[PDB]
Amino acid sequence: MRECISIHVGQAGVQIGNACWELYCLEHGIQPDGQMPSDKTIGGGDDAVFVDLEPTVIDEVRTGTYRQLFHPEQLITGKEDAANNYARGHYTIGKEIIDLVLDRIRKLADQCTGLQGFSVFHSFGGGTGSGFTSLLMERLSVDYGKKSKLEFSIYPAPQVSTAVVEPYNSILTTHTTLEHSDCAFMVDNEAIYDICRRNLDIERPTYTNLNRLIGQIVSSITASLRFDGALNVDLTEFQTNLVPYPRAHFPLATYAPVISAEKAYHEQLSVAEITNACFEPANQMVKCDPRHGKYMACCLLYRGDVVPKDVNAAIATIKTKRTIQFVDWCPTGFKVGINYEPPTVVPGGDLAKVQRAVCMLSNTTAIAEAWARLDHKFDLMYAKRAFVHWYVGEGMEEGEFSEAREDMAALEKDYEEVGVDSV
Amino acid sequence: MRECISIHVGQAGVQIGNACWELYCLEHGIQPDGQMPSDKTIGGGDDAVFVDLEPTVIDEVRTGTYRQLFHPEQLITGKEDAANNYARGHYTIGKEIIDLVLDRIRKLADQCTGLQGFSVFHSFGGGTGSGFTSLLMERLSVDYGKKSKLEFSIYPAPQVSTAVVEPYNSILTTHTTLEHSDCAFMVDNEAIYDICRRNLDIERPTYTNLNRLIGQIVSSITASLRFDGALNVDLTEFQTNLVPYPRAHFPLATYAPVISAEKAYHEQLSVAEITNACFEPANQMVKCDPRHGKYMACCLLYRGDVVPKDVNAAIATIKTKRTIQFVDWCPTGFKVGINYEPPTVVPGGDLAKVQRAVCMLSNTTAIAEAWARLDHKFDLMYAKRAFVHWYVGEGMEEGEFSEAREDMAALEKDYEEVGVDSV
Amino acid sequence: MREIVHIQAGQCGNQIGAKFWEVISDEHGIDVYYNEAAGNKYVPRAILVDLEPGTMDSVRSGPFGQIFRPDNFVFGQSGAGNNWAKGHYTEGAELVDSVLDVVRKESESCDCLQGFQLTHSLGGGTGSGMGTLLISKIREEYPDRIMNTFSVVPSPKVSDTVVEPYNATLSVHQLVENTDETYCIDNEALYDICFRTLKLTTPTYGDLNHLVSATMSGVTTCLRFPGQLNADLRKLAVNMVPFPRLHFFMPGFAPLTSRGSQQYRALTVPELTQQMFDAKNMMAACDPRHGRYLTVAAVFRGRMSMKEVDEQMLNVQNKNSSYFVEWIPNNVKTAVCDIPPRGLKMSATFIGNSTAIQELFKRISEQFTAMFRRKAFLHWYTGEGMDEMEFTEAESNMNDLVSEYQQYQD
Amino acid sequence: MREIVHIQAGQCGNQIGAKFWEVISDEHGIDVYYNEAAGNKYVPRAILVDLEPGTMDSVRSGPFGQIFRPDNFVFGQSGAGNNWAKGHYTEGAELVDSVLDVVRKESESCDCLQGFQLTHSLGGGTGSGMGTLLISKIREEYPDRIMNTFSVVPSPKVSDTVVEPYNATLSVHQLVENTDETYCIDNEALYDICFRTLKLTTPTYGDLNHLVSATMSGVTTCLRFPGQLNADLRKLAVNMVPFPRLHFFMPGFAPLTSRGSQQYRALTVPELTQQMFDAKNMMAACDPRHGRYLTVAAVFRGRMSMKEVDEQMLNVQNKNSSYFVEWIPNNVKTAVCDIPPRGLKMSATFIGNSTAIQELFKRISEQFTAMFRRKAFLHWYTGEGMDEMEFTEAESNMNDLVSEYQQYQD
Ligand SMILES: Nc1nc2c(ncn2[C@@H]2O[C@H](COP(=O)(O)OP(=O)(O)OP(=O)(O)O)[C@@H](O)[C@H]2O)c(=O)[nH]1
Ligand SMILES: Nc1nc2c(ncn2[C@@H]2O[C@H](COP(=O)(O)OP(=O)(O)OP(=O)(O)O)[C@@H](O)[C@H]2O)c(=O)[nH]1
Ligand SMILES: Nc1nc2c(ncn2[C@@H]2O[C@H](COP(=O)(O)OP(=O)(O)O)[C@@H](O)[C@H]2O)c(=O)[nH]1
Ligand SMILES: Nc1nc2c(ncn2[C@@H]2O[C@H](COP(=O)(O)OP(=O)(O)O)[C@@H](O)[C@H]2O)c(=O)[nH]1
């Protein structure tokens, strides 16, 4: 019934998103629905806003297409080849295609009574979809304040793609928080170009390889908890559990049963053979290390028919390990949710169908680590000279940084105001 | 295409020039062209102004002729047997035939678009062509300022031809400079009546003998660098390299492979067997001695097909000699130019054809020497009485000298403002 | 979209910029096949421009003497030899209007305009005085647009008592005027290759020019057409230009080798990753091993093991850790792009902002203050305005970089 | 072009000037062959002029008594003996108009007029009062044109208590009036040759006149027709006349020898270069070895080794370095001119401005103040005006040269 709206701004997002409605092939929301909004109310009553700043990556849908097309009209596009100077795409250009996107949205986010929701598929570190969304939201939050916002922002990859890239995050977060977003799932490409190279073999992890995998996880969240069924959830009730303080805390993600096809799935993994790898480092998203941090939550998400009586069997075994450890102000437990719906895999794209899907969500005060090191490859140059003059000769600033480095600093600050002491 | 105009005033010039278009028999610019201007644009689109003040020496062309005739009309002529009192030919008489010459020129220098150039074949030390050209230029410079001017002025010969001769140069240079001419190649007959007697045997070096040799050199300059081909040059770009300061510096000339016919050419001289004699005193023009003077340039001109890789072979060997030495404010190097075109010799007139022609151009601060001694055989008499009353009783003066002795003095003055110190 | 408006001016500039379009081999039909034809329709967007009549040489000769012919610039009869004042104050300010009339009736052409990569060789006023003018003339008109230039620096060898005091009055703005980004060759380095490494008992311009083109193309069309992912002509100027007064790129091919049974690692895949990163194979010749590079772009050519390339490219990035500024988090990025040239089976393409080019600067700097100031020879320009300075405020600029550059070279 | 209007006046002047044209042998046809016939058409441009009837003697006699005959001057009956006032103030001022009527209807004759070389012998009022008048009468009319004169100075011997106080009133202007240039003979020197050197128990005018003509011709027609290069009748007065009040030339042939098996060096080629440069063979007899020569012209005749001549002519120029002013850079120039005379096989011709002629001046100077002033005899001129001075202002002139000349003689 009540549909949350989604908007993927920027190649990294468009490409991701693009490979999600491909994963969102899980049931009814495919056949003769093209322009057939009618029927049931969910999966998208017309399974939607694609706004890129590079009319092309976002053109492998309509003009030339790309195996498919939802609704030629919901994919805003410009001409300005790109940007890549945050300001250059957040101000200058942005300011141009932000009222066709904000108009479109409203003229979508305002269809069929009762809104509630906005899943913004992001990706930061490259203007357009790094600087233009910094605005999108500043806008939405201005006209949907009572509505919540999620964002699967793709974190940069230590394989370091671009300089001037590190610094975007900072002049980005600084306002792409309080001024919006209650939750946000950091991805960190580094992760996958590592996992989709280990747990999934693959030599040179192509973007799609990495999309057919950041795309699965997204289902095992949004989708995983966004179609009634049995045990359920509400977007409103997504933070209440996962979100400690308004300081938008970034919950860490972790998928566990990942098996290619060329290797042995082992017939199956006990409903617990999984929920431990699910606790294995290399099976997370943000390449963190909650090995030094008191969870402020933690809540499993099993998928594809499972009987509780067997779940706790590991929620136990684990418990028996002196490690883990929570904080205080939180009942050092879980919130485990089970889905009977089977884990949807695609043709060579997802690689092997599982019997049991498992992907939990915990916000350990340790993400702060792999989350401030990104503040080093910044306090580094961007404090001692750096490419600062482009974020000027293409827009305003000269403290567009600094000014926006404290709150994005006060983060690892806050992340200790919940970890250094018994309060 | 773009042709520079040439005007030879004065027997010494007429005779020279007369034997140059004879040397300028180097290719197409001979057959049925008589009054056939058509075809290719060079060597003279009608291979031209001959203005002498003695209707006769300049009459061995048309009336009686002399083995040939370019264009009966371009050889202005008077009646006034001669003159020889600078004023007597620069003022008095000159003032008469200077508007048939300046008219003819303009009505030549203004044919076929794009001018640029004036090669004034001279010869100073004897009015008419010593005093009438002092005016020609004073005129041209008045109606072609934007155009450049070269002048192969033949320097007097210590075998001293005429008194009152020494002193012309002085009341001549004084204004036949700044007020015209960017470059000027001093010949100094002394030279040849010596070289065309040594390296060319010959007992009593007849004017033609001396013309069939000042004539060759001129080709290996003007011609040598005035018909595209391969490596090239532009008149505008003749001083840029050869001309230090506006103080019209007189570049010193030097031809190297000189062999009669009656003696052994030695089959050939290594392309370097030459470029050293080319650095032997006796093979120069002005009987100077750059043995005491920091070159401000120096640029070789090889002719008749040569491969660079062998040239520097001597430009090297030489370099290895502590001597030579440049100034400072100039990259103590060269500007070497090679011509594939073979060295054109004439029937007994040029004496033997070479395999490799070589003639460089350097302006050593030592020409000043053989160039101010000519100021002695003047400060001598022309300061203590001298024939000064003719340059009066045949025109104005009484300081036509002196007044015009300082700047022609300031010369060996300047020639040290580029040689006494490290500036 | 990367509509690139290729500019090519000056005699001894067209000659190179010409046989470049000889290197851009894909002709006029008859051929990834998912082409990225940047610039203009199927006729070189090129806009040749000469002061004299050099727009013909081999320009309109044996190679491809059809560069949109009915547009070429000459004006018809002129001059401008080796006088900067000329072709930037005089016999050219005539032409400008002509050009800045045909580039516009060319630039526009619907599709978003990339910028203008202007070719030419610093220090020769014909098209290195006309062009350096075009820039300041294309600039302050097309601010937004990014400008490029493949300027050629006069080999320290020294042609002309003027092929030197020339350009030093260019890098007096060819770095404060439109030129947000500009690669740079040094004829010195070019002789030296056809000598100090490659063979050739002498380098015919038909030699000391080859690399000049198989190096531009090796940075041009690539980072342009399909290959691995993509690239345009501007995100560059933002990852390769840490500062305003920017820095000149020090390009550098690699598989130059020489004839012979080229078994010198016989183009080993890791060879490209060495056959390149050295002054023995750099087009500016300036001991890179001097100061670190503020950044560096690579462009591996000729389909081969992309693994080895990141395994090798980081290698040296992990090797001479003494030459990578180290205050610019990941001062390098590779690029692999399929379809190879016409004789290597593999080939790279250096493009680094190495503070070593400093040399190839303080050169055309200790000749002016050491000549055109040590006394004179300038009394050849004043003819065309240029009175007094304009050679000192110009010396109080390009001479600066010494200091500027020396501030991170460290 | 050197259209020379030859003048010949006075009895004892025509006689010499006549047999001159006897010396100019090339007749009226029947003969370098690239002739320089200066003067007039094939009839001596000569314009003989006598006060009495002397225009006939041997004039219109055995030699060539056809000097344009139908023009000759006499007026018809007259006189003018040895009275300067006469033929320059009187019985001549009648004739002048006559002459200055036929020289003009002769001078003109199209071709550019050289000037006028006027012959005569100073101190004899017939044609050395008429002529000295002609001058001041050809002058201040033909300024431009250069005038010449082969005046003959009355041998110190002293004919007439008047063949002396005569000319002294001539070199009173025959050097301040048209005479930009004038050679000069001294009869004294002429006896002396036919005595002190050459033989002759007595010099018939048919002796003391020979040299007079084989000396003029030796400076006339040469430096005129073909020979080596060329020459005219005026560039001379500019290389041989250092000053206004000029200086009189001291002519001087050489191969005079005498009969006998002339083996005195038998006209050795170097002999000419000695047989000439001495007072034992000079036509003014004035110890040249006195003062240096401000200049000197030579004119070797009779085809022979031009080498020897410059080898010899500089020789003495390098020899008596004590007699060449030495403030006039190259106070000498040779001249070689093929075709020889009628009996030498070789022959030279001195023409020097030697301050030695001073003597041949202070002579006709210590006779006036030493006579015509020492008291009188002048009471023979006053008859025809000439009252008082005019013999003292004339003495306050030619006497000057003493000083003037003596100022470089040194
Ligand atoms: N998760 C994910 N990340 C991607 C994908 N493609 C690129 N990226 C990463 O996302 C960033 C790429 O951003 P770009 O597409 O260059 O830029 P953008 O911000 O999306 O938009 P523009 O500024 O207009 O180019 C880099 O950090 C890439 O490593 C993809 O398919 N999936
Ligand atoms: N180089 C060279 N110099 C010559 C030649 N002929 C004459 N001269 C020089 O020119 C001068 C000789 O001039 P003359 O022949 O006496 O006179 P002119 O030049 O006819 O006299 P004007 O008509 O008044 O100029 C000397 O300086 C000679 O050295 C010649 O063929 N070549
Ligand atoms: N790289 C390169 N340089 C050249 C070429 N031809 C000439 N040059 C050099 O270019 C430098 C700059 O001046 P030049 O190019 O001649 O100037 P232009 O005549 O205005 O084009 C000179 O020093 C030449 O040596 C060529 O084909 N390639
Ligand atoms: N050398 C020379 N001197 C002569 C000749 N006839 C006369 N004289 C000189 O002339 C003077 C006397 O005669 P001249 O004055 O000529 O007589 P005029 O012609 O009647 O005036 C003397 O001084 C003679 O020396 C002659 O034939 N030869």
CSV table of N, CA and C and ligand atoms in Angstrom, one decimal, chain D residues 10-13 16 121 123-127 152 154-155 163 187 190 208-209 212, ligand 4:
chain,number,residue,atom,x,y,z
D,10,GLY,N,98.6,83.9,-78.1
D,10,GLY,CA,99.9,84.5,-78.0
D,10,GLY,C,100.9,84.0,-79.0
D,11,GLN,N,101.7,84.8,-79.6
D,11,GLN,CA,102.7,84.4,-80.6
D,11,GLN,C,103.6,83.3,-80.1
D,12,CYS,N,104.5,83.7,-79.1
D,12,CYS,CA,105.4,82.7,-78.6
D,12,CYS,C,104.7,81.7,-77.7
D,13,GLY,N,103.5,81.4,-78.0
D,13,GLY,CA,102.7,80.4,-77.3
D,13,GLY,C,102.1,79.5,-78.3
D,16,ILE,N,104.3,76.8,-79.6
D,16,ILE,CA,104.5,75.6,-78.8
D,16,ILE,C,103.2,74.8,-78.9
D,121,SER,N,102.4,81.7,-72.4
D,121,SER,CA,103.6,81.8,-71.6
D,121,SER,C,103.6,83.1,-70.8
D,123,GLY,N,104.0,86.5,-68.8
D,123,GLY,CA,104.9,87.6,-69.0
D,123,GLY,C,105.2,88.1,-70.4
D,124,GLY,N,104.2,88.3,-71.2
D,124,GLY,CA,104.4,88.8,-72.5
D,124,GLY,C,103.1,89.4,-73.2
D,125,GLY,N,102.3,89.9,-72.3
D,125,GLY,CA,101.1,90.6,-72.7
D,125,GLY,C,100.3,90.4,-74.0
D,126,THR,N,101.0,89.8,-75.0
D,126,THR,CA,100.4,89.5,-76.3
D,126,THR,C,99.3,88.5,-76.0
D,127,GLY,N,99.7,87.3,-75.7
D,127,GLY,CA,98.8,86.2,-75.4
D,127,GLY,C,99.1,85.7,-74.0
D,152,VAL,N,103.9,79.2,-69.3
D,152,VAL,CA,105.4,79.1,-69.4
D,152,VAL,C,106.0,80.3,-68.7
D,154,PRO,N,108.9,82.7,-67.6
D,154,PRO,CA,110.1,83.4,-68.2
D,154,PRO,C,111.4,82.9,-67.5
D,155,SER,N,112.2,82.1,-68.1
D,155,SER,CA,113.5,81.7,-67.5
D,155,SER,C,114.2,82.8,-66.7
D,163,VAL,N,110.4,91.1,-69.9
D,163,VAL,CA,110.1,89.6,-69.9
D,163,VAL,C,110.4,89.2,-68.4
D,187,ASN,N,111.3,78.1,-68.8
D,187,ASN,CA,112.3,78.1,-69.8
D,187,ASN,C,113.8,77.9,-69.3
D,190,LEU,N,114.4,74.6,-69.3
D,190,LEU,CA,114.5,74.1,-70.6
D,190,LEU,C,115.9,74.3,-71.3
D,208,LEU,N,114.5,74.0,-77.3
D,208,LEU,CA,113.9,74.4,-76.1
D,208,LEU,C,112.4,74.6,-76.3
D,209,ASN,N,111.8,73.6,-77.0
D,209,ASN,CA,110.4,73.6,-77.2
D,209,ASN,C,109.9,72.2,-77.4
D,212,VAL,N,108.6,70.7,-74.4
D,212,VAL,CA,107.4,71.4,-74.1
D,212,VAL,C,106.2,70.7,-74.6
E,4,LIG,N1,109.6,77.1,-73.7
E,4,LIG,C1,109.4,78.1,-74.5
E,4,LIG,N2,109.3,79.3,-74.1
E,4,LIG,C2,109.0,80.2,-75.0
E,4,LIG,C3,108.8,80.0,-76.4
E,4,LIG,N3,108.5,81.2,-77.1
E,4,LIG,C4,108.6,82.1,-76.1
E,4,LIG,N4,108.9,81.6,-74.9
E,4,LIG,C5,109.0,82.4,-73.7
E,4,LIG,O1,108.2,83.5,-73.8
E,4,LIG,C6,108.8,84.7,-73.3
E,4,LIG,C7,109.0,85.6,-74.5
E,4,LIG,O2,108.0,85.4,-75.5
E,4,LIG,P1,106.4,85.4,-75.2
E,4,LIG,O3,106.2,86.1,-73.8
E,4,LIG,O4,105.9,84.1,-75.4
E,4,LIG,O5,105.9,86.4,-76.3
E,4,LIG,P2,104.4,86.9,-76.7
E,4,LIG,O6,103.7,85.6,-77.2
E,4,LIG,O7,104.4,88.0,-77.8
E,4,LIG,O8,103.6,87.4,-75.5
E,4,LIG,C8,110.1,84.2,-72.7
E,4,LIG,O9,110.0,84.1,-71.3
E,4,LIG,C9,110.4,82.9,-73.3
E,4,LIG,O10,110.9,82.0,-72.3
E,4,LIG,C10,108.8,78.7,-76.9
E,4,LIG,O11,108.6,78.2,-78.0
E,4,LIG,N5,109.1,77.7,-75.8
